[PDB]
Amino acid sequence: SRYTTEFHELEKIGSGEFGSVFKCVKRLDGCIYAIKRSKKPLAGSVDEQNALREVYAHAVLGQHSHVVRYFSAWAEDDHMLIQNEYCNGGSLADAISENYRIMSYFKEAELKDLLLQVGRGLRYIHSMSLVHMDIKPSNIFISRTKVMFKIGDLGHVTRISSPQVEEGDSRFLANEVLQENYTHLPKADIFALALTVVCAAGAEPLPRNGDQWHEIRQGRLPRIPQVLSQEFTELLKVMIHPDPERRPSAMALVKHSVLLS
């Protein structure tokens, strides 16, 4: 078994439809990795093409400081194993839940930092003519010890020039993608990033549909209980503009003074 030969398993850190994710130490280098272990997808299934999008996204991208690093993938014993960088801070979804548990929150400066850093990850992905298509808090990961945010799960990554769109979570989905308009996909990532920051900011749980859903896609920003400066707030609001061309590109985002300050 390559998995057991190369690695010692420390604890399960995720599970779901499939499979599990384990925190492991690699024996040769003594470093900690996250390894996703699952039953090998049925040939031709959605789960397989997700795994395919992921491997081939990595082949294009290689490494970036705001993208969760993909080291290796292999299959053995009717399982698929995917080795990633371990982010010791968990996902942004975890951190938001923990904030509610203990009644903490992200200060405005910390929210801007989140926005800027994920923006930097999108800038790189977009510059390679890819789009992520599943930005949301559970796919943003956190490395600490001083904090780095990284984009995880490239399973929905597709090409701008020949997009195959597996829709993401309807809570974070821009209206034009739902309308099967795939001509501005980088701006769907920007949209979802705005709502991701809004979630991080303490907003009520986002609607999956209904009037509240549609109101959001009209460019109306959900209520945020923290007082944010008006400049920060207006930047979030423009990121969910109904006209995607009025949303900033990631390039424009990471040069924004409100964020760099």
Ligand SMILES: CCN(CC)CCOc1ccc(Nc2ncc3cc(-c4c(Cl)cccc4Cl)c(=O)n(C)c3n2)cc1
């Ligand atoms: C620490 C105790 N707890 C309570 C929250 C259990 C879960 O806590 C976590 C601690 C750290 C992480 N970090 C982490 N770091 C990297 C990955 C990478 C993948 C990943 C992805 Cl997104 C795609 C393909 C392959 C992999 Cl390994 C992953 O699924 N998870 C959960 C990942 N998780 C998480 C929870």
Ligand SMILES: [Cl-]
């Ligand atoms: Cl098993």
Ligand SMILES: [Cl-]
């Ligand atoms: Cl641009």
